[PDB]
Design a binder for this molecule. Structure first.
Ligand SMILES: O=N[O-]
Ligand SMILES: O=N[O-]
Ligand SMILES: O=N[O-]
Ligand SMILES: [Cu+2]
Ligand SMILES: [Cu+2]
Ligand SMILES: [Cu+2]
Ligand SMILES: [Cu+2]
Ligand SMILES: [Cu+2]
Ligand SMILES: [Cu+2]
Lengths: 333, 333, 333
C-alpha cells in the first residue's frame, strides 16, 4: 500500500555533479519526489559563438541525474511554463509501460503533470523527451538526461564483493546537427519553430556538426575540469541518448565497466575503451593511481578533438615512479 | 552415417513470422531440407513511392528465418529461375568452410544447387548472398536473412534454468543506399544492371538513404504491428547483415539479451538498448508486463523516425498501476 | 628494486608478423627494452596509386606489436631522426599516468627519449602518437600500433583451462581521410605540413576515403595472405585506434573472442562477427577445421569490399565433407 510509504523530496543539482544519496539504502522502499521544469533557451555551444535553441530539463544539457534504489517509486512532477513554445513530454528507459511515460506526460506550455513509476530494474538509464512526430528534433536539441537505480545493497564487483565509490560524476554527451548555408556557415534562428525544417535536413545526413560533453565545447576543461585525488575511487556515469560513443580515460582505465549500464551483470575488467550504444547510459569505476591532468574522451579522436567530445580530470597527489618514469628526458640525439 | 538419419521437409514462412519448430528437440539429429527460390523484383520502400530493384530470397526482405538444432544437418536447395538477370549464391555465417557455402553455391539464372552443412554452433546467425566482386551490392539490395540454431535442450538463463518463449518474431533491418540526382531526388531504373555504377557511388558515402524493418517504412505498423499479451514471453530475433544497429523496446526492456546472438554465452540482463554489430544476428527475450502500444526501434532516433527503422507491438491485457500511473493528468498550471 | 631485475632486448618484426615470445613466462618479471624509430614517408595506399604522407612507428602501418607479460616493465627508447619534419610522441593505452606517456615523450626531429612503465593489466592495447593540438591528424596518418600484455600463465578459456595458440597474427585496421578536389579526385602534396588544413576538413566529414589492413588495399592478399593449416590454433590481434570495426572470418568463427581485448574477462564463445570499439585492440582465437581460402573482413561490407578492409587466409589440409558438402553442383534446371 503506497500511501503508507515514506516520502522524501530531493532537490536536483546541475551536471556534472550529482545530488546527495546513499549507496547502501538505510531505509526501506520510498516514494521519491522530484520536480523538473522544462526550459527552451538560447545556448552558445562552441568557441566561435555558434548558437542553438536548446530544449532542456531544468535549464541544463544534459538534464540532471536522478538517483534512486531498486523498488523505490519515482514521482516526477513535470512543468512546462507558458514562456516555452513547444509541446514536450518524458520517456524513462527505466520504466515499464506507456512508452516509458511518454503517452502520459504530454504537456503544452502552461501545463503540468505528475507521473509515478516503480523502478524495478537496477542500472543507469537514459531519460528523454519524445513527442509524437518530433522525437529526434527534441532529443538532439539537448532534451535528455539519465537516472541511476542503485541496488539496495549498492554496487558489487565481478566476485560480488562491495565496490564503494568516493566521488561520482555525470557526463552527458550530445550530438548536435547545426544547419549550414551553401558555403558551410552555421545558420542562426530567432525561434526554435523557425529552425525545424532545416534541422530535419541536417539530421538526415547522420553527421553531427558538434559532439560535446555537458552542453558545450570545453565545458569540462580548466576552470571546470573534474577533480579527484590519488587513491580515490570515482564512478563516471556517461550517457548518449541518440548515438554510439566510446569513452576512454587518457592515462587511465575502466577498472570496472558496465558498458551497457545494468548492474545485475558482472562488470568488464581493465577496459581501455568501452562502447556505449546510442540510447544507453553506462558506468565506469576507476581508482586513480597517479596525479596530474587526464583527458576523458570519446575515442573516435576526430569526434573528440575536432568536434568537442573531450573533458579534463585534474588529480592531486603523489607521483609513483614504479608505475611510470622518464628514464631519459627528450634530448638532442 | 548420414543416409541413416531422419529427413524432415520444412516449408518456410514470410517474416516477421517464423516456421513451426520445437524448442527442446524431441528427436535425435536430422537432415532438415529447405528450398529457397531467388527472386529479383521491384519494391516500393517508403510512403513517397521510391522504387528499388530488390534481390530477395523467397520474395521477401529479409529472407525467411530457418530454425534447426545443434548438430542437425541443413540441406538447402537454392533455385535461380531464368526470369532473373544476375548470378547469385549463399554464404551461411552458421557454417564452416568454403566462404560459408559461397564458393559452392554460384548459380546463374536457370541453375540450381543443393548444399549441406552441419550446424555445429548454437546461436542466431546471418545468411546472405556474396558473389565475387559484387557483395555489398547484393546484400544492400535485400539479399540476406538469418538462421537460428537452437541448443538441443533449448534456451537457458544466466543461471542455466530453462527459458521458454511463447512467441517469436524475426526483425530484419536493412540499410538501402538509393542513388540521388544533383538536387537530391531518388533515381529510378528499369533493370538492376542499369543501377549498378550509381549504386557503388551511393554506397561509398556510407550514409544510407533508408533503414527499414521488414523491407519498407512502416511495414510493422498498425495493420501489421506485432501482437502479444501481458504475461507472454516473446523472443525477438533481429539481424543486420551490413551495418550496426541498436534495438530498444519503448516502454520495455531486454530482460535477457544475446546481443551478438550466440547461446553458449550467458545473456545480458535488464538491457534498455543493446548493440548488434553489422554482420550479426542477436536475440532479446521479454515478458510483457503492461498492455498498450510499444514502439521497437533502432535507437539512433534519426535512423528510427526519419529513415524508417521503427515498428510497433500492440499488446492486449490488464493495466498495472503499481508499475506506472499518472498521478496528475496534464492540466492547466 | 629495479636495478636487480633481468634485462632482455627484443628486436621487433614488421606486421602482420609478431616477434618471438613465450606464452607462459619461463622467467620472473623483466625490464624488456624496445627501440622504435619514427619515420614520416610517402605511401601508396590503393591500386589507383593514391599517395599519402604517412607517419609511422618503425616504417610500417600499423606499428609493430610489442609482447610482454603482466608486471614486466616496458622500457621504450623512441627516436625522431632529423630527416622528419614534425614533433611526435607516444601514448600507451596499457600504461598509467602522464596521458599514457604522452606528456613525457615529446620529441622534436633530432631528439630521442626513453620511457619506462609497468604493465599492470593484461590484455591487448592500442598505442599511438598524440601531440597537443594535432592528435587525430597523426593517428589517422598511420601512427598507431598495439602491445599485448600476456598473463604470466598465458591465456585461458571461459572455464579457466589453458588455451595455447600455434600461430599469431596482428591486423592493424586504418581509416584514412584523403582530401578531394571539387570533382572528387584525391589531391597530392609534397610535404605533410602542406596537407594539414585540408586534412582537418576531410576528417571532419567523419567519412573515410579508405579503410585498409596493414597499410594498403590488398596488402594481405594473394602473395601476402596469412597462412595456416587445418587443426592449427590461431590468435588474430586486431586494432583500430580511431574508429569502430566489426571483424569476421568468412567460412569460420571466433571460437574464443575478447572483443575489447582484456584477458581477465572470460571470452565470448562462437562469435560470427564481433565489435571492436575505436581506440581498442581485440583478439579472436580460432581452430581451422577446413582447408581453402578464407576472407577476413570488417563486416560493414561496403567498408570491406569498396574501401579496402579485407584480407585473406590460405589454409592447407584435408577437406571434411561431414562439415560441408555440395550435394548437387550448380547445374541446369
Ligand atoms: O590515448 N588517448 O587518446
Ligand atoms: O525511449 N525510446 O526512444
Ligand atoms: O560472410 N561474410 O561476408
Ligand atoms: Cu521536448
Ligand atoms: Cu529512448
Ligand atoms: Cu545475389
Ligand atoms: Cu558475411
Ligand atoms: Cu606523430
Ligand atoms: Cu588513445
Amino acid at each position: 500500500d503506497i500511501s503508507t510509504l515514506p516520502r522524501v523530496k530531493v532537490d536536483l543539482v546541475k551536471p556534472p555533479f550529482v545530488h546527495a544519496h546513499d549507496q547502501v539504502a538505510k531505509t526501506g522502499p520510498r516514494v521519491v519526489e522530484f520536480t523538473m521544469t522544462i526550459e527552451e533557451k538560447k545556448l552558445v555551444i562552441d568557441r566561435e559563438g555558434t548558437e542553438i535553441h536548446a530544449m532542456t530539463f531544468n535549464g541544463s544539457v544534459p538534464g540532471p541525474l536522478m538517483v534512486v534504489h531498486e523498488n523505490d517509486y519515482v514521482e516526477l512532477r513535470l512543468i512546462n511554463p507558458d514562456t516555452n513554445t513547444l509541446l514536450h513530454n518524458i520517456d524513462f528507459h527505466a520504466a515499464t509501460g506507456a512508452l516509458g511515460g511518454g503517452a502520459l506526460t504530454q504537456v503544452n506550455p502552461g501545463e503540468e503533470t505528475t507521473l509515478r513509476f516503480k523502478a524495478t530494474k537496477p542500472g543507469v538509464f537514459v531519460y528523454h523527451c519524445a513527442p509524437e512526430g518530433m522525437v529526434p528534433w527534441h532529443v538532439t536539441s539537448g532534451m535528455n538526461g539519465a537516472i541511476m537505480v542503485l541496488p539496495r545493497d549498492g554496487l558489487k564487483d565481478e566476485k560480488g564483493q562491495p565496490l564503494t565509490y568516493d566521488k561520482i560524476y555525470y557526463v552527458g554527451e550530445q550530438d548536435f546537427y547545426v544547419p549550414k548555408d551553401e558555403a558551410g556557415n552555421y545558420k542562426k534562428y530567432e525561434t526554435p519553430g523557425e529552425a525545424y525544417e532545416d534541422a530535419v535536413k541536417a539530421m538526415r545526413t547522420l553527421t553531427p556538426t558538434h559532439i560535446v560533453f555537458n552542453g558545450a565545447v570545453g565545458a569540462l576543461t580548466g576552470d571546470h575540469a573534474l577533480t579527484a585525488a590519488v587513491g580515490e575511487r570515482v564512478l563516471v556515469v556517461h550517457s548518449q541518448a541518440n548515438r554510439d560513443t566510446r569513452p576512454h580515460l587518457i592515462g587511465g582505465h575502466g577498472d570496472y565497466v558496465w558498458a551497457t549500464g545494468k548492474f545485475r551483470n558482472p562488470p568488464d575488467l581493465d577496459q581501455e575503451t568501452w562502447l556505449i550504444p546510442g540510447g544507453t547510459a553506462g558506468a565506469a569505476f576507476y581508482t586513480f593511481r597517479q596525479p596530474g591532468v587526464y583527458a576523458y574522451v570519446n575515442h573516435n579522436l576526430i569526434e573528440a578533438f575536432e568536434l568537442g567530445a573531450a573533458g579534463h580530470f585534474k588529480v592531486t597527489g603523489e607521483w609513483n615512479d614504479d608505475l611510470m618514469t622518464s628514464v631519459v628526458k627528450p634530448a638532442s640525439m
